[PDB]
Amino acid sequence: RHTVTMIPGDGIGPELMLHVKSVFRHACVPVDFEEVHVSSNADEEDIRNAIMAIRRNRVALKGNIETNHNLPPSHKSRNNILRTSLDLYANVIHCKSLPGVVTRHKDIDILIVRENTEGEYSSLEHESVAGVVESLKIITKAKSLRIAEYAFKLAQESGRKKVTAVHKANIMKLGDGLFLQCCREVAARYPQITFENMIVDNTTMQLVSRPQQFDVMVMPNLYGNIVNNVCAGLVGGPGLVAGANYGHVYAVFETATRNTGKSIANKNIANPTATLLASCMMLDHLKLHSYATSIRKAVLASMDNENMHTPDIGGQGTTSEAIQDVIRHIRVING
């Protein structure tokens, strides 16, 4: 039995965590969740104890913590503090077209590897004179090499063929230039993988017209934010895609789009797919591959059934009805 940190988060986080536990029970998953809450408190003790809990358990499943952007700059994103404190350097999401979820594009199969600790998320800002604000985007060789190594290794291990570095090196000559140069050094050690690069604006144009051209994509922090959400949208939205955050030792799992979803919270309409797929992802990481495969086949099979669809993908079903169907699919798998 494994002990895994669970951080319910805000909005749809807590309600979906209950369904994760419920699904884990029916599948007899040898996992015990140790819950840690993070309030809206300006004080950091909550987010620090959560870090401590993940340091101990090494693995976590979390909902999204709301960032109040009206508070002073001293009050920093708790999701970001967490991400960067634990040095979870690789944000990884897999956007794949689901046969049961018909959107404007099909045959999308994209692995996005996003630098997850650096860049425009460095929280370095100051006001030199009144009304003049500077924000410091930090790009380093160590972290750019690190994320490129990850993307190429992933591409090779999962039998992918192309890695596309996404950047703005034509304008951000030194910063994005360094990121790209680091990707290129790694590319020389993976001669069997096609390496390409694309400016981030053009990338978004290509994604909304011919997203089938992309295989693995690697990029710094903000561009990952953008591309993740574009690709998540192309395949059907926030309710479908799981996100992983990998460090050398720790790992934290969530939904790809990192959305609070406060406007649909507590209405039994949230799509449970992304969160459940994230928990399978976590089970694989824990080497509980058979449990991961049971649940993942159950949730994917339920998504084939239009009747099980929640409103976010144009259905009319409730969350609990989707879970009912997922559980129905599981208890015939394990007898």
Partner 1 sequence: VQTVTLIPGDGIGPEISAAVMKIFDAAKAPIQWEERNVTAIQWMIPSEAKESMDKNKMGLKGPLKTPSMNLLLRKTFDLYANVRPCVSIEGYKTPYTDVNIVTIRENTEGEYSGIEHVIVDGVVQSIKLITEGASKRIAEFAFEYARNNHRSNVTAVHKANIMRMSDGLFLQKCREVAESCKDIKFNEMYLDTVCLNMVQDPSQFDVLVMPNLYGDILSDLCAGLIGGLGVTPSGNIGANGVAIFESVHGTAPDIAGKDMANPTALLLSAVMMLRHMGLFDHAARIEAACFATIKDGKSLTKDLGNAKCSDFTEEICRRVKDL
* Residues of this chain that bind partner 1 (CB under 8 A): 67, 69, 71-73, 75-77, 80, 103-105, 120-121, 123, 125-127, 130-142, 168, 171-176, 178, 200-202, 204-209, 222, 225-226, 228-230, 232-234, 237-238, 257-259
Residue 26 or 76: the one with the smaller Cβ distance to partner 1 is: 76
- Which of partner 1, Mg ion, none does residue 105 bind to, with CB < 5 to 8 Å depending on kind? partner 1
Residue 65 or 155: the one with the smaller Cβ distance to Mg ion is: 65
In the complex, minimum distance from the CB of residue 209 to partner 1, in angstroms, rounded to a whole number: 6
Residue 307 is labelled as binding a ligand: no
In the complex, minimum distance from the CB of residue 2 to partner 1, in angstroms, rounded to a whole number: 32
Pairwise CA distance, residues 90 & 102, whole Å: 30
Residue 55 is labelled as binding a ligand: no
Longest pairwise C-alpha distance within the chain: 69
Rg (CA), the chain: 20
- Which of partner 1, Mg ion, none does residue 138 bind to, with CB < 5 to 8 Å depending on kind? partner 1
- For residue 152, how many C-alpha atoms fall within 13 Å in the half-sphere facing its CB? 22
Residue 202 is labelled as binding a ligand: no
- Which of partner 1, Mg ion, none does residue 72 bind to, with CB < 5 to 8 Å depending on kind? partner 1
Residue 107 or 134: the one with the smaller Cβ distance to partner 1 is: 134
Q: Write the CB contacts of 152 (distance below 8 Å, at least 6 apart in sequence).
A: 163, 186, 187, 189, 190, 193
In the complex, minimum distance from the CB of residue 118 to partner 1, in angstroms, rounded to a whole number: 10
| DSSP-derived 3-state class of residue 127 | strand
- Which of partner 1, Mg ion, none does residue 64 bind to, with CB < 5 to 8 Å depending on kind? Mg ion
Q: Which residues on neighbouring strands pair with residue 109, listed in sequence order?
A: 96
Pairwise CA distance, residues 11 & 153, whole Å: 35
Q: Looking at residue 52, what DSSP letter applies? A: H
Cα dihedral 77/81/82/85 (nearest 10): 170
Residue 83 is labelled as binding a ligand: yes
In the complex, minimum distance from the CB of residue 120 to partner 1, in angstroms, rounded to a whole number: 7
In the complex, minimum distance from the CB of residue 12 to partner 1, in angstroms, rounded to a whole number: 15
Residue 114 is labelled as binding a ligand: yes
Residue 334 is labelled as binding a ligand: no
Q: Write the CB contacts of 267 (distance below 8 Å, at least 6 apart in sequence).
A: none
Q: Where on the chain is the footprint of Mg ion (CB under 5 A)?
A: 64, 201, 258
Residue 259 is labelled as binding a ligand: yes
Burial per residue of 239-275, b for 16 or more beta-carbon CB atoms within 10 angstroms, e otherwise: bbbbbbbbbeebbbbbbbbbbbbeebbeeebbbbbbb
Report whether 175 contacts 123 (CB < 8 A).
no
Residue 122 or 156: the one with the smaller Cβ distance to partner 1 is: 122
Report whether 245 contacts 91 (CB < 8 A).
yes
Q: Write the CB contacts of 298 (distance below 8 Å, at least 6 apart in sequence).
A: 326, 327, 329, 330, 333
Cα dihedral 54/150/214/92 (nearest 10): 0
Residue 103 or 318: the one with the smaller Cβ distance to partner 1 is: 103
Residue 110 or 295: the one with the smaller Cβ distance to partner 1 is: 110
- Which of Mg ion, partner 1, none does residue 22 bind to, with CB < 5 to 8 Å depending on kind? none
In the complex, minimum distance from the CB of residue 18 to partner 1, in angstroms, rounded to a whole number: 25
Query: What are the tokens at 267?
Result: 């209405």
In the complex, minimum distance from the CB of residue 48 to partner 1, in angstroms, rounded to a whole number: 20
Binding-site members for ADP are 259-260, 271
Binding-site members are 67, 80, 83, 114, 201, 259-260, 271
Binding-site members for substrate are 83, 114, 201
Binding-site members for Mn(2+) are 201
Binding-site members for citrate are 67, 80
